[PDB]
Amino acid sequence: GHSLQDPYLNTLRKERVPVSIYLVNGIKLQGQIESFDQFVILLKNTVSQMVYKHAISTVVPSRPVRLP
Amino acid sequence: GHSLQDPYLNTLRKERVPVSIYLVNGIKLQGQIESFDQFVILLKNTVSQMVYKHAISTVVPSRPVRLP
Amino acid sequence: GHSLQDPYLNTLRKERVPVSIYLVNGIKLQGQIESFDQFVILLKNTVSQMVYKHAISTVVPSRPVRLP
Amino acid sequence: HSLQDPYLNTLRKERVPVSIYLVNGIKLQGQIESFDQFVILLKNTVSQMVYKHAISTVVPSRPVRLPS
Amino acid sequence: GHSLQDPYLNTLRKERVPVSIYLVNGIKLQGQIESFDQFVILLKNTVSQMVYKHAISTVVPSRPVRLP
Amino acid sequence: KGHSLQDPYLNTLRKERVPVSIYLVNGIKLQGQIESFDQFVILLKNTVSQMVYKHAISTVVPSRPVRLP
Ligand SMILES: Nc1ncnc2c1ncn2[C@@H]1O[C@H](COP(=O)(O)OP(=O)(O)OP(=O)(O)O)[C@@H](O)[C@H]1O
Ligand SMILES: Nc1ncnc2c1ncn2[C@@H]1O[C@H](COP(=O)(O)OP(=O)(O)OP(=O)(O)O)[C@@H](O)[C@H]1O
Ligand SMILES: Nc1ncnc2c1ncn2[C@@H]1O[C@H](COP(=O)(O)OP(=O)(O)OP(=O)(O)O)[C@@H](O)[C@H]1O
Ligand SMILES: Nc1ncnc2c1ncn2[C@@H]1O[C@H](COP(=O)(O)OP(=O)(O)OP(=O)(O)O)[C@@H](O)[C@H]1O
Ligand SMILES: Nc1ncnc2c1ncn2[C@@H]1O[C@H](COP(=O)(O)OP(=O)(O)OP(=O)(O)O)[C@@H](O)[C@H]1O
Ligand code: NA
Ligand code: NA
Numbered sequence: 001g002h003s004l005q006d007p008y009l010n011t012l013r014k015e016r017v018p019v020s021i022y023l024v025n026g027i028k029l030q031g032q033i034e035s036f037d038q039f040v041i042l043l044k045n046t047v048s049q050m051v052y053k054h055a056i057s058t059v060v061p062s063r064p065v066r067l068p
Numbered sequence: 069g070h071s072l073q074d075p076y077l078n079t080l081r082k083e084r085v086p087v088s089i090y091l092v093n094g095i096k097l098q099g100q101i102e103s104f105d106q107f108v109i110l111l112k113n114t115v116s117q118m119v120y121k122h123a124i125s126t127v128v129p130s131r132p133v134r135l136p
Numbered sequence: 137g138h139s140l141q142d143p144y145l146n147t148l149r150k151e152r153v154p155v156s157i158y159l160v161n162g163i164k165l166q167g168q169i170e171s172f173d174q175f176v177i178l179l180k181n182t183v184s185q186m187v188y189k190h191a192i193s194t195v196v197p198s199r200p201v202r203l204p
Numbered sequence: 205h206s207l208q209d210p211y212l213n214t215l216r217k218e219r220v221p222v223s224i225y226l227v228n229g230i231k232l233q234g235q236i237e238s239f240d241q242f243v244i245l246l247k248n249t250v251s252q253m254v255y256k257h258a259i260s261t262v263v264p265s266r267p268v269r270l271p272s
Numbered sequence: 273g274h275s276l277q278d279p280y281l282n283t284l285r286k287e288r289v290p291v292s293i294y295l296v297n298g299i300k301l302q303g304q305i306e307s308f309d310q311f312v313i314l315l316k317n318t319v320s321q322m323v324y325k326h327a328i329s330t331v332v333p334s335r336p337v338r339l340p
Numbered sequence: 341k342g343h344s345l346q347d348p349y350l351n352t353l354r355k356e357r358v359p360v361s362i363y364l365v366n367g368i369k370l371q372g373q374i375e376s377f378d379q380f381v382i383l384l385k386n387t388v389s390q391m392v393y394k395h396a397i398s399t400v401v402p403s404r405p406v407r408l409p
Pocket of ligand 1: 022028
C-alpha cells in the first residue's frame with residue numbers, strides 16, 4: 001500500500017529536509033515538502049507548487065533520513 | 069485521499085488565482101481554474117479548455133494559496 | 137468525480153462543436169465528438185476514429201461553450 | 205467500455221484494415237485479430253500484442269458502422 | 273478481459289518462443305517470457321529482468337504462434 | 341496472477357542484497373540495492389535512500405541472476 005511512501009514523505013515533511021523531485025520527463029524540482037496526500041505533493045522553495053505523484057520518477061533527499 | 073488536492077484547487081478556483089499548469093510533455097498552459105472534478109480541470113483564460121489530470125505534472129499558482 | 141467531464145463532452149457533442157484534441161505527445165486532432173464513454177472518445181471526420189482518454193492532454197472547443 | 209468493445213468487435217469481425225497510433229507517435233497498421241480488456245492482437249506480416257495503455261488512437265481505413 | 277493476454281503470454285512462456293518486447297520509450301528488449309503476473313513480466317536472457325507492463329507498448333514473437 | 345511474481349522477486353533482490361539497475365521510463369538508469377518496497381514505491385539505497393515510483397520504472401535488472409522461491 002502506501003505503507004512506506006507515507007512515513008517516508010512524512011519524515012521529510014516533519015523534518016523539513018531539502019529534496020530533489022525528478023519528474024518522469026526529466027524535469028528536476030527542488031524544495032521542501034510542505035504537505036501531501038494520496039495523489040499530490042506540495043513542494044515549496046522559490047515558488048510554491050502542487051505536484052502530481054503520477055508525474056514523479058524519484059524523490060531524493062539531500063541527506064540520509066530515518067526510514068520506516 | 070484527496071484531502072490536499074481538493075481544498076487547494078477549490079481555493080485557486082474561488083479566489084480566481086492565475087495559475088500555470090505544466091503538462092507531462094513540457095507544455096505550459098496558463099489561466100484560471102473555473103472548475104474541476106476527480107479527473108479533469110476546466111481552465112479559462114484567453115483560451116478555455118478541459119485538461120486531463122493524468123497529463124498534468126505540476127500546478128504553479130502565480131502567488132501562494134492559503135488553505136482552509 | 138465525473139460531474140464536469142461528462143456534461144462538458146456531452147455538450148460539445150450535442151452542439152456539434154468542432155474541437156481540437158491535443159494528445160500527450162503533442163499531436164493535435166480536430167473534429168466533432170460523435171460519442172464517448174468511460175475510456176474513449178469517438179472523433180468524427182473523414183472516418184470516425186477512437187481516441188483513448190488516457191492519451192489525451194486537453195480538449196479545446198473552437199468556440200466558447202456553456203453547460204446550462 | 206460500452207463503446208470501445210462493440211467498436212473493436214466491428215473492426216475485428218469485418219476484418220477492417222486499421223491504423224493504430226501509439227502514445228509515442230509510432231504508427232502500426234494491420235487488422236484487429238482479437239482483443240480483451242487490456243490488449244489487442246494486431247495481425248499482419250508478423251502478428252503482435254499491443255497494450256491499450258500504449259495506444260493513442262485507432263483509425264479504420266474506411267467508415268464503419270458505429271455502436272449506438 | 274484477460275482472455276487474450278494470459279493465454280498469449282502463457283503460450284509464449286510454455287513454448288519458450290523468442291520474443292521482442294518494445295517499450296513505450298523506444299527500447300527493444302529481447303528474450304523469452306520466463307513468467308508473468310498481472311503487472312510484470314520476467315524476461316529471460318543474460319539475467320531474468322523484471323519488465324513492468326505499463327512500460328511496454330508491444331510484444332512481438334519471433335515466429336507465429338497457434339493459440340489454445 | 342496479482343503480485344505473485346513481482347513481490348517475491350523484489351523480496352529476493354532485497355534479502356540477497358543483489359545490486360540492481362533500475363531503468364526509468366525516460367531512459368535514466370538508477371543503481372543501488374533494494375532496501376524495501378511497497379505496492380507503489382521502491383527505496384533504492386546508495387548515498388541516500390531515494391524513493392522510486394514503480395509507475396516510472398520500465399525494468400529492474402539484477403547485476404547477477406537470482407532464483408525465485
Ligand atoms: N535519482 C534520480 N532520479 C531520476 N533522474 C535522475 C536522478 N539523478 C539524476 N537524474 C538525472 O539523470 C541525468 C544525469 O545525471 P547527472 O548527475 O549527470 O546530472 P546533474 O549534472 O547532477 O544534473 P542535476 O543536478 O539536474 O541532477 C540528469 O538529467 C539528472 O537530472
Ligand atoms: N514548476 C514546473 N513544473 C514542471 N515543469 C516545469 C516547471 N517549471 C518549468 N518547467 C519546465 O522546464 C522547462 C525549462 O523552461 P524554464 O523553466 O527555464 O522556462 P520558464 O522559467 O517556465 O519561462 P516562463 O516563466 O516565461 O514560462 C520548461 O520547458 C518547462 O516545461
Ligand atoms: N491547449 C493546448 N494543449 C496542449 N498542447 C498544446 C496546446 N496548444 C498548443 N499545444 C502544443 O504545444 C506546441 C507549441 O505550442 P504553440 O504555443 O507553439 O502552439 P502552436 O504551435 O501555435 O499551435 P499549432 O501547432 O496548432 O500551430 C504545439 O506543437 C502544440 O501541439
Ligand atoms: N489519428 C491519429 N492519431 C494520432 N496521431 C495522428 C493521427 N493522424 C495523424 N497523426 C500524426 O499527426 C502528424 C501529422 O499528420 P499529417 O496529417 O501531417 O500526416 P499524416 O498523413 O497523418 O501522416 P501518417 O498518417 O502517415 O502518420 C503525424 O506525425 C502523424 O503521426
Ligand atoms: N532492461 C532495460 N530496461 C530499460 N531500458 C534498457 C534496458 N537495457 C538497456 N536499456 C536502455 O539502453 C540504454 C543503455 O544500454 P544498456 O547498456 O543498458 O544495454 P544493456 O541492457 O547493458 O545491454 P545487454 O543486455 O547486451 O547487456 C539505456 O539508456 C536504457 O534506456
Ligand atoms: Na534529469
Ligand atoms: Na506520430
